[PDB]
Amino acid sequence: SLRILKLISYSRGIRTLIIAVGETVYTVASVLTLLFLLMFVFAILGFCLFGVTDRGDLENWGNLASAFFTLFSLATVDGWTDLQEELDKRKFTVSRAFTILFILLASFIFL
Amino acid sequence: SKYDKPYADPVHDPTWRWWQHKTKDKDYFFYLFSNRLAAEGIYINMNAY
Amino acid sequence: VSYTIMHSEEINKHYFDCVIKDAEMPCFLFRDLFQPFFLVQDLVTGDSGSFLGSYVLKVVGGGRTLNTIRDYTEEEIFRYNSPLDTTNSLIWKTKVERTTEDKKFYIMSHESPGVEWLCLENSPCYDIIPQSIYPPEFFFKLLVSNRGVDNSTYCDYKLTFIVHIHGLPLSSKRTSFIVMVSTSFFIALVVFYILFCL
Amino acid sequence: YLGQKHYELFSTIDDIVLTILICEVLLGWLNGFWIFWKDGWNILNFAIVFILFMGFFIKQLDMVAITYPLRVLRLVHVCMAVEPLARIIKVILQSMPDLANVMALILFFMLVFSVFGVTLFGAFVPKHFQNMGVALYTLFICITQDGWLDIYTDFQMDEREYAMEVGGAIYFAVFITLGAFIGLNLFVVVVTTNLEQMMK
Amino acid sequence: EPENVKKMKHYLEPLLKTPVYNPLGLNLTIQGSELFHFKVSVVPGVSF
């Protein structure tokens, strides 16, 4: 596939398109850094809210990589229903409010 | 003569129903009685009645 | 009682008692469908088994509050329970096909769909005004018999007891009366306002 | 496994970052309390260091869920200072006054259509349509529009042919699609307005 | 402490002048750097 990328390295029209879209690299890097900062903030928040109590909800707000992936899914639209059905049974009523607040900030702001 | 009430109730046992909250103080009253301190030395138990 | 509570919970997804909870007395909801269960206990033995069969139910009296109940005559019970009565006096109607001899009263079992309560215009549900807050409550004294629907008992277990209900909305005129009196008084007031504003 | 030989070093670096933060706050205070109090972000930094210092010195139930997010909030505040994120951050806060009216209109329409919602809700197809707050948040879930076929199967099989399974479902489906489209459009519209402001 | 030793604890803790615990749920937490020497006894009158 890298060889195929070297193939598509031709086509001066696509080169001009790449040049025309190449000034947004710093902007998309800045938006990615803001995204990552928000994932880190809500990663430590979700850990402190659900994984330190250690009464369930493991590998969703527990281990770091699984927690990060669940947060990325919650920032997207996918998996939110089943994640909510997983978290509402852990005697944490305000977890639903926290998760819908997290959605209405992260998903809308990012997209 | 009183357990002819028309309701089903839990497991019938009228002595158990009137005991109720006092079924959890068996050893409590036993310790109070054993050292000869509780009341006039009178002890009432479960299975007698 | 406990089987009735949990069956109402499973069927209607809810079960509401009175504002004053009673341990022996459960307040059944009028909106919730009622499915009666009964059991025969042999108190001289350690045996108490559910009644897996048919039984006869008929309301024999109604009361607003405590000791305000009276028994009903045979013609009264015929009006209030027998589907043959064309007069709108029926208290309940169950979508069942089984009926006793002479087609007098409905016969229902443990497998029956349930009891649907009506208490139509001739019943004392109509013209009900509680004297205080909260929906009015009612008690219905009734007997369950096994007189002619048994092939395995030598005598019937004729049991008389009371069923509670709350939330009674049964009438009509009163709503019309309050509606027309409100319309008449408000149009009189508005016409007075118009004439005195001119 | 890392913590058992790092907890004392974690405590020392906590003390070091707390004392350098309060030293920076004191240095800012030196120029004047009035100018530091009348600022848009120094108020946030002062609140951050005040909460952290009170939870450190005085006994508090604030614990890890306050100590760590306050540190990463300070991280965000410091990383805002360097230039190639400050322009982007400045216009996110410029977009929220124009976003707030969109949120208000969305929630008002959400309520006045939930009055239509709660009519076919309550005591039937329950546990997501009842309680009048769970119903609102479940309609919000369905408006966010992902995996609502659990709800579709939940209110499925009323009569198996039409019932209200036609009527209520099409009413709420067209409401969901209209609200989702309008909300997403209004969000990107407020974003494009405020950034047109930042390039103007 | 369930609703089984409430009356025991409320009767005993006055005249023994010491806290009274319930077994089968006892756990300890120590904040020290030394030797801790603990003794466990059973309340009088319940054994010979």
Next chain:
Amino acid sequence: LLGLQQMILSLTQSLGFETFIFIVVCLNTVILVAQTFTELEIRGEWYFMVLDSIFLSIYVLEAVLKLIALGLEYFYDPWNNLDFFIMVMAVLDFVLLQINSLSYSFYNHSLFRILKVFKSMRALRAIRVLRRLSILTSLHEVAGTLSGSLPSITAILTLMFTCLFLFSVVLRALFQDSDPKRFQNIFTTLFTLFTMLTLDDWSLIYIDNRAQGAWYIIPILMIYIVIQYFIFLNLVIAVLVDNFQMALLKG
């Protein structure tokens, strides 16, 4: 009592419509939002419907006043047409409850569902007539700039309607005797095409259609999904963005 009655009705209608209608509709809204409220209706169910009938009598008095009022220009207002429609269903269900007897099913039936949704747009019209004051100019301008481009969005929704109907026809045609049990009729068909248009378990459709013997229906669904998604969402986003963009270019 002709034109003189009309001008007396105009002046006294201004006065009594400012005074009486506002307070009674506010009280109707208060009792209706305390009514819907499926936790306090059991703390009620007897003081609730009597007040419903009383305030519906007040509403039919409003209807009687509007009928005796100037007439044709009152009918010329679409909101007043909605009011007349609501009063028509209100008197219909009121007399239906009043006559009693009858011969159809009752005790919380589908007709009763139709009645309480009737009370739902009654509450909506109460909310609409309570906001005569302080609609707030910021969201007023926002709503006007929303409603500025009506023909474009109506054309786009007409196009999406035609495209969904075509996709529904072709998919129902190609899925014959291919377990239609999820979409055996036109309603469930168009609902499945709504799910396919709203990104809801169409991957599940792919995985449970691979269990069937048909495989080429998956690329067809695939290309249809992606083209209608990109075209429709991009068209609506672009149209509304530019519509607010000329408003931004102006003052």
